[PDB]
Design a protein around this ligand. Sequence first.
Ligand SMILES: [K+]
Ligand SMILES: [K+]
Ligand SMILES: [Mg+2]
Ligand SMILES: [Mg+2]
Ligand SMILES: [Mg+2]
Ligand SMILES: [Mg+2]
Ligand SMILES: [Mg+2]
Ligand SMILES: [Mg+2]
Ligand SMILES: [Mg+2]
Ligand SMILES: [Mg+2]
Ligand SMILES: [Mg+2]
Ligand SMILES: [Mg+2]
Ligand SMILES: [Mg+2]
Ligand SMILES: [Mg+2]
Ligand SMILES: [Mg+2]
Ligand SMILES: [Mg+2]
Ligand SMILES: [Mg+2]
Ligand SMILES: [Mg+2]
Ligand SMILES: [Mg+2]
Ligand SMILES: [Mg+2]
Ligand SMILES: [Mg+2]
Ligand SMILES: [Mg+2]
Ligand SMILES: [Mg+2]
Ligand SMILES: [Mg+2]
Ligand SMILES: [Mg+2]
Ligand SMILES: [Mg+2]
Ligand SMILES: [Mg+2]
Ligand SMILES: [Mg+2]
Ligand SMILES: [Mg+2]
Ligand SMILES: [Mg+2]
Ligand SMILES: [Mg+2]
Ligand SMILES: [Mg+2]
Ligand SMILES: [Mg+2]
Ligand SMILES: [Mg+2]
Ligand SMILES: [Mg+2]
Ligand SMILES: [Mg+2]
Ligand SMILES: [Mg+2]
Ligand SMILES: [Mg+2]
Ligand SMILES: [Mg+2]
Ligand SMILES: [Mg+2]
Ligand SMILES: [Mg+2]
Ligand SMILES: [Mg+2]
Ligand SMILES: [Mg+2]
Ligand SMILES: [Mg+2]
Ligand SMILES: [Mg+2]
Ligand SMILES: [Mg+2]
Ligand SMILES: [Mg+2]
Ligand SMILES: [Mg+2]
Ligand SMILES: [Mg+2]
Ligand SMILES: [Mg+2]
Ligand SMILES: [Mg+2]
Ligand SMILES: [Mg+2]
Ligand SMILES: [Mg+2]
Ligand SMILES: [Mg+2]
Ligand SMILES: [Mg+2]
Ligand SMILES: [Mg+2]
Ligand SMILES: [Mg+2]
Ligand SMILES: [Mg+2]
Ligand SMILES: [Mg+2]
Ligand SMILES: [Mg+2]
Ligand SMILES: [Mg+2]
Ligand SMILES: [Mg+2]
Ligand SMILES: [Mg+2]
Ligand SMILES: [Mg+2]
Ligand SMILES: [Mg+2]
Ligand SMILES: [Mg+2]
Ligand SMILES: [Mg+2]
Ligand SMILES: [Mg+2]
Ligand SMILES: [Mg+2]
Ligand SMILES: [Mg+2]
Ligand SMILES: [Mg+2]
Ligand SMILES: [Mg+2]
Ligand SMILES: [Mg+2]
Lengths: 119, 149, 207, 126, 50
Amino acid sequence: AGVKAYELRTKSKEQLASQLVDLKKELAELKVQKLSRPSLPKIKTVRKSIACVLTVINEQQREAVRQLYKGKKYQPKDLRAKKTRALRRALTKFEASQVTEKQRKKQIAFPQRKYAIKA
Amino acid sequence: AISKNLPILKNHFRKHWQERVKVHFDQAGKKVSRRNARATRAAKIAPRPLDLLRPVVRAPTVKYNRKVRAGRGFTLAEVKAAGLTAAYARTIGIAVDHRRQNRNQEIFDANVQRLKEYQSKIIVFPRNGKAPEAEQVLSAAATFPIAQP
Amino acid sequence: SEKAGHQTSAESWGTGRAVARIPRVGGGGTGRSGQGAFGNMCRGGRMFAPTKTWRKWNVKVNHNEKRYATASAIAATAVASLVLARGHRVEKIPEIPLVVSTDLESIQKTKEAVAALKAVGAHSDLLKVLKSKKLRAGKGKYRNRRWTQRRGPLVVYAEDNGIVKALRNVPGVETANVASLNLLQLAPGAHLGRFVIWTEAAFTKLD
Amino acid sequence: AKQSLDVSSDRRKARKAYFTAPSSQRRVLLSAPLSKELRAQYGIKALPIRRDDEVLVVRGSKKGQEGKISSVYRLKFAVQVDKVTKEKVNGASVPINLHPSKLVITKLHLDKDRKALIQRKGGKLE
Amino acid sequence: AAQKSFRIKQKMAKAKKQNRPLPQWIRLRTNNTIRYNAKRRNWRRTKMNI
RNA sequence: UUGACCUCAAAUCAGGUAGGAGUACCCGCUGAACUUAAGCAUAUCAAUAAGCGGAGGAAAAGAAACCAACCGGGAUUGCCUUAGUAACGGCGAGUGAAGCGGCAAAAGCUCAAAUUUGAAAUCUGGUACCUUCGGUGCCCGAGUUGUAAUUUGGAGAGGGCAACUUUGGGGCCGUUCCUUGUCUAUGUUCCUUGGAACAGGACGUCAUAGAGGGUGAGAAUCCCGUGUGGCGAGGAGUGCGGUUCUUUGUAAAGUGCCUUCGAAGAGUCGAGUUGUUUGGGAAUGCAGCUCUAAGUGGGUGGUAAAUUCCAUCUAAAGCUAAAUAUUGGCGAGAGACCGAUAGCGAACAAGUACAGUGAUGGAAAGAUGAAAAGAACUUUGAAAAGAGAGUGAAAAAGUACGUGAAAUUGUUGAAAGGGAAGGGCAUUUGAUCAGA
RNA sequence: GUCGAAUUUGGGUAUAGGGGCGAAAGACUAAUCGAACCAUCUAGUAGCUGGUUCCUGCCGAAGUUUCCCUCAGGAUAGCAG
RNA sequence: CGUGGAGGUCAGUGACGAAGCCUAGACCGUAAGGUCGGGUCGAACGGCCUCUAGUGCAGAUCUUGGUGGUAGUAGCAAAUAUUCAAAUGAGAACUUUGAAGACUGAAGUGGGGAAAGGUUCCACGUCAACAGCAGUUGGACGUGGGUUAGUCGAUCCUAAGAGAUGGGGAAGCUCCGUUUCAAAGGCCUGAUUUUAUGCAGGCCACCAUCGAAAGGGAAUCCGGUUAAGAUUCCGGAACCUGG
RNA sequence: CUAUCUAGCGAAACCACAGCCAAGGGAACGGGCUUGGCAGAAUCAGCGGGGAAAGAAGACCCUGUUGAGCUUGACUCUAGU
RNA sequence: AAACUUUCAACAACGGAUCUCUUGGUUCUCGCAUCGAUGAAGAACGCAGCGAAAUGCGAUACGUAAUGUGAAUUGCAGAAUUCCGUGAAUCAUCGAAUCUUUGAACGCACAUUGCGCCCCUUGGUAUUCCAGGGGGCAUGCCUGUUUGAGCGUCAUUU
Ligand SMILES: [K+]
Ligand SMILES: [K+]
Ligand SMILES: [Mg+2]
Ligand SMILES: [Mg+2]
Ligand SMILES: [Mg+2]
Ligand SMILES: [Mg+2]
Ligand SMILES: [Mg+2]
Ligand SMILES: [Mg+2]
Ligand SMILES: [Mg+2]
Ligand SMILES: [Mg+2]
Ligand SMILES: [Mg+2]
Ligand SMILES: [Mg+2]
Ligand SMILES: [Mg+2]
Ligand SMILES: [Mg+2]
Ligand SMILES: [Mg+2]
Ligand SMILES: [Mg+2]
Ligand SMILES: [Mg+2]
Ligand SMILES: [Mg+2]
Ligand SMILES: [Mg+2]
Ligand SMILES: [Mg+2]
Ligand SMILES: [Mg+2]
Ligand SMILES: [Mg+2]
Ligand SMILES: [Mg+2]
Ligand SMILES: [Mg+2]
Ligand SMILES: [Mg+2]
Ligand SMILES: [Mg+2]
Ligand SMILES: [Mg+2]
Ligand SMILES: [Mg+2]
Ligand SMILES: [Mg+2]
Ligand SMILES: [Mg+2]
Ligand SMILES: [Mg+2]
Ligand SMILES: [Mg+2]
Ligand SMILES: [Mg+2]
Ligand SMILES: [Mg+2]
Ligand SMILES: [Mg+2]
Ligand SMILES: [Mg+2]
Ligand SMILES: [Mg+2]
Ligand SMILES: [Mg+2]
Ligand SMILES: [Mg+2]
Ligand SMILES: [Mg+2]
Ligand SMILES: [Mg+2]
Ligand SMILES: [Mg+2]
Ligand SMILES: [Mg+2]
Ligand SMILES: [Mg+2]
Ligand SMILES: [Mg+2]
Ligand SMILES: [Mg+2]
Ligand SMILES: [Mg+2]
Ligand SMILES: [Mg+2]
Ligand SMILES: [Mg+2]
Ligand SMILES: [Mg+2]
Ligand SMILES: [Mg+2]
Ligand SMILES: [Mg+2]
Ligand SMILES: [Mg+2]
Ligand SMILES: [Mg+2]
Ligand SMILES: [Mg+2]
Ligand SMILES: [Mg+2]
Ligand SMILES: [Mg+2]
Ligand SMILES: [Mg+2]
Ligand SMILES: [Mg+2]
Ligand SMILES: [Mg+2]
Ligand SMILES: [Mg+2]
Ligand SMILES: [Mg+2]
Ligand SMILES: [Mg+2]
Ligand SMILES: [Mg+2]
Ligand SMILES: [Mg+2]
Ligand SMILES: [Mg+2]
Ligand SMILES: [Mg+2]
Ligand SMILES: [Mg+2]
Ligand SMILES: [Mg+2]
Ligand SMILES: [Mg+2]
Ligand SMILES: [Mg+2]
Ligand SMILES: [Mg+2]
Ligand SMILES: [Mg+2]
């Protein structure tokens, strides 16, 4: 029924590479068989297993690189958050919350008060 | 095209006027939206009457100087005579207008009087106290109506 | 659509080609080429005098004239002959106008609201509804107007203490605050004599 | 009699939503009422039909016939019941498409998820 | 021209692969408003225009 | 000989940014003509179409070098008015604002010009660590040709006197909002018709649910939903209510009096001229060229100029939410709209097929049946098909498929007919038929 | 007619619309030329031509006056409802 | 009078048959029209009081679609020309084979190519449509197969010319200009070899790029082979470039 | 070689309705109307008298307060100089 | 008298009107603000057991990963029914990836699937040649870094 990503995540990158090689060999033999046998659908399962193995390999490699770049500024661009271009160009929360000393003093001295009418 | 005895008409429709025709189908929708916005603004701000206290003011243009109406904001002189600073009045919901000047003692006295009434009829919540809910009234203008002398 | 029928570069062929001088789609190779365009008489052309949104839709009525009409409809609700002539099967009914106890305003359940209406004699009108329901004739039936039915009693109250919700599921039955009486409900189809069931509080607040 | 502004009474929108409903929504659309005995036993009225449910046809030409669902043909908005079939002239048998609203479930195919669904809907005894 | 650019040969290959009638198992699908291949092209009737 | 500085370079130097798309609405530039004037050139169309540059969720404008002339109003924007008015115009055709007033929404502000001079107190970057929209330490560098604090005209600053009053940022739980999930009522009771009951009748039930849709015909009660509530899940933020350590700080801010001051924007205002534009008319704005200010000054005060006053603001620097717009995008709810020659060109593999070198042009085309149950089998024929048989409620539904008009056509039946036919009045004859 | 040089011709290339190109015909410029084609302004304007969709009832004309850059039009008076 | 839609009403009509359609059948109205019977048909529709309009067709060389008379008519007559038998086939003037008679007559009706086309090439099956007769045949229909290169071309060069950069113009889309008012560069190597490197001995540039399948140009021939590929495959025999 | 006839195949132009004349009158040259002459199915090949035959909203002429190409000390401008 | 012509009716044709349908259009209102050098819009070419298109996707190709639901998909074939389960599905959701050749398009070019340069690595003795794999080389501008030029210019040595 194909490979499972949660089973592949328990394996090392060497085991994943060897499983990918075996899956490629199996797919090659299956497409050789497809020339004679009509309507052979196992090649779809083998293709999806290859895709899953490659996905898990890429996941492990990218997690290792994320750990290598943890905490430090200038992460790789494909590892940075993909918001929109305008959102990534927008001022951070620290900026546009920056205020001058005069403005901070006056907004501390005279904040918007809470007041109710009672008549 | 000058036919029988009719008044001379001046219908200015020789431009592409059909490209700019605003039919206010959204009159009722915009009224509902304005009422909704007023409700959310009242809920968002603390108990507070949805508008600032406005001064009494004489209209220019003798066609209208016989009547009195709400102005933009109290003058600095009126605020000082009422015992407040402009910044504090702006933070306790009094509109302040640095442009207007006082040359009429009647209007100045009326504005100082309504400022004092507003101060005696509002409760300013402490910054770091308890201040139990004070039953927000929505209209300072309705609470302090403008009276024609 | 303001561009409907005019999304073409069609031009008149002019005279000398034994065809009408209507503008014709140019080009070739598709069948649309050479066809008439831009004419109200042309297939796929623009309709004559295309409908415009700035048509007058709402009609201004003098407020006093509107109140005159509402007062006339209210008065017509008291005339049993008009109520009978407007459908409104009030034959084995007590005096018109029909005033019921203010307890009706506090009814919360549709079951007891219907029971009270039947007790006060609106059962024949309630049965006229739920039996007059018929599929609407014509294209309106697939324009969110699929079904038509007769109008039942208009229950008028002074304070809504649940009667509106208790009666809103009863077919044909309408509820109205006495402070705001609707002419469209008091004289449906411009026909005087709506069968109105007043509560005591609404009847006293009419003055 | 609808009150919320999020639901539409538009017949065109309702028909489009029904006819373009995905498979997961068609599972709900293809619910069937429980029989009287199962309604008494579980305390719920209707359930989405499942492939191994046992049903009794209560409407149509096949009224009174019983059997086990063979497939929930969600694409056709119909279910196929075993031994409820049409015999073609050539001797073959083809399943009769039935709508679950015209059946009653006489025996539920139960598993952990079905039992959890019973309890979530407020049913008793798994 | 028998001396053709690869781009031309690639478009030629795509046209060759899509020059086929409608598959016969289509027209058996549930709704299947499709009756025939309405985009069939022939060299004797309509030119590819590159 | 070395080390600077200034300016200018180079590097696949370290880190970033711009392009393009969309473009309904928005900010500018550029810019017609058809048209109207019953001709036509000014005018009009129109400060529009087309072309070009540039943003956002709105944009722009915006806290007066304003309006006014009043007992004075007081940022901007939008609506109702002003007003088809003042005014412009071969004063022809036409065009055409603004003040006030009512309302919607309301919000205010900050730089330059000041010596911190007893202390560049300011900031980017690199690096290490950390509690990572950032912080701390260190080190280059930027910067005195001026980066911080202090002040923005409403003021305000430097000194002296007197005291009083006020206050800073994060967690936790709720709340607000957004995106979602799930649960929550009542007949498939009987009779008739029907292929099918969802029809009619009888008896019932729920209704804060009788909106809508589906199911073999008009279904509240068969199903999904609907109505009313309940229970969750993931996020945005602190809008705001408790919770507790952070307690900032002999720091910051406000207030009165006396005194000395009070810096406030230049090829800019303004003027001449030219062109364009405006309702702006001895010149409304704009722009080119020439001239070119002042500081009790300058601008405006809708008739050019001189003289004397007065009134009102403070340009040549800057930010700002809402009310406003929205034939684009996304998500919804609707209609006295159209019902396949209609409605978008496109209900369908439609901007598709197809045409053109190209820019571009651009269709036609929906419906068997409840369900294929899509006609097993026999027979004639080479076959297509026919005749049967059969399925189906119906084949007068056979995929050349709901109904199935007319033009036009075949067969049958009837009738008439010497170079038209058709028609009107009247009756004979034949056919047919209502009423009593 | 001409047929060995002002020759014929392929391909590449250049010149684009009030522009090109022309041993010159207003010729050619993709069957388009005394101003190409395409889209938009544009449903351009037309005193001019054609058409302008049910019934019945009642009443019922004018082609004449004056003026017009007017003479195939309009205004005006008259006739009519 | 009639039509589409809307409010009210007749608790109107209807799968025991709505609407529609056909009907030298009947009734009513002067008429617009209305009503009924019969047939067909299958899911909605009508009377009345009002509301509303994209509301009534014979025309517009009207628009779209469909259909006639003409009419089984005009005609299917240029390119010398066909005939006999057999096979196949349901069916042969047209397919195949054989025989005969002819033509293109090497400036071809032959054998290859350039542009263009794009699978039309070839095989098998096969004739509903197309091949203006026919068809068993086909450039048709359906399914498949087929195009093999160091040496043949492209690729490289420059031609007329096109066109960035540096600069200048233009509100701008973009225009000029092609070595120009530019600080426009890497390949040789002593030394560096704390590293054959930057510094630092020492030599050279009035310049991107695109532009030819007929111009220039490194190098391949013969024989055989397929249903369809051949200077490409196979066998043999060479050559050129780079290392 | 057609035309002709046959097998197969099979359009188009045009068409208010259609198609015998004479005279009359009539929009002043009728296929229809009036008065006469007359007049018998269904047709084939030719033919060019007629259908004021067809092909095209006359290109000539005139009108339009409709254009355009071109010219000129028309009016008003304009690049350039 | 037939044939022929014409009129009407029935049935059958032609044709697709009418009627009734409608997952579409059109208009109005409400709510929201989110494309792109972290490579957009658009284009080319490919991808399924059997697909030409539409739709989806990119050599991980009608798709992978994750989450939810809870037993399908369906035209046939195939697989499975443990399906009381980290588990069907052409399901929904969607935060992790892949994302060919392109395209503002970025080594130079492009009517060429043309031609380079640099780094690491692998093979052919191989730093130089050839080839395979991986990663890079556009322009303008800003801040900073480094290396520089100029009697533009200061100080010092002189
Ligand atoms: K001309
Ligand atoms: K709609
Ligand atoms: Mg249309
Ligand atoms: Mg109808
Ligand atoms: Mg770099
Ligand atoms: Mg841009
Ligand atoms: Mg116009
Ligand atoms: Mg004019
Ligand atoms: Mg005119
Ligand atoms: Mg003119
Ligand atoms: Mg524009
Ligand atoms: Mg944006
Ligand atoms: Mg807004
Ligand atoms: Mg702004
Ligand atoms: Mg100011
Ligand atoms: Mg103002
Ligand atoms: Mg007025
Ligand atoms: Mg104007
Ligand atoms: Mg201060
Ligand atoms: Mg329910
Ligand atoms: Mg139904
Ligand atoms: Mg200033
Ligand atoms: Mg201009
Ligand atoms: Mg601004
Ligand atoms: Mg259409
Ligand atoms: Mg049809
Ligand atoms: Mg039938
Ligand atoms: Mg047919
Ligand atoms: Mg039919
Ligand atoms: Mg007929
Ligand atoms: Mg005869
Ligand atoms: Mg001449
Ligand atoms: Mg018109
Ligand atoms: Mg009379
Ligand atoms: Mg005159
Ligand atoms: Mg005339
Ligand atoms: Mg209509
Ligand atoms: Mg009927
Ligand atoms: Mg008839
Ligand atoms: Mg039906
Ligand atoms: Mg009409
Ligand atoms: Mg007609
Ligand atoms: Mg007519
Ligand atoms: Mg016609
Ligand atoms: Mg026609
Ligand atoms: Mg013939
Ligand atoms: Mg001939
Ligand atoms: Mg011949
Ligand atoms: Mg022959
Ligand atoms: Mg032979
Ligand atoms: Mg010869
Ligand atoms: Mg010979
Ligand atoms: Mg062949
Ligand atoms: Mg033939
Ligand atoms: Mg044949
Ligand atoms: Mg073939
Ligand atoms: Mg060669
Ligand atoms: Mg250039
Ligand atoms: Mg080249
Ligand atoms: Mg060569
Ligand atoms: Mg060959
Ligand atoms: Mg060899
Ligand atoms: Mg005669
Ligand atoms: Mg005569
Ligand atoms: Mg005649
Ligand atoms: Mg006669
Ligand atoms: Mg002849
Ligand atoms: Mg003749
Ligand atoms: Mg004419
Ligand atoms: Mg003419
Ligand atoms: Mg005239
Ligand atoms: Mg002219
Ligand atoms: Mg990509």
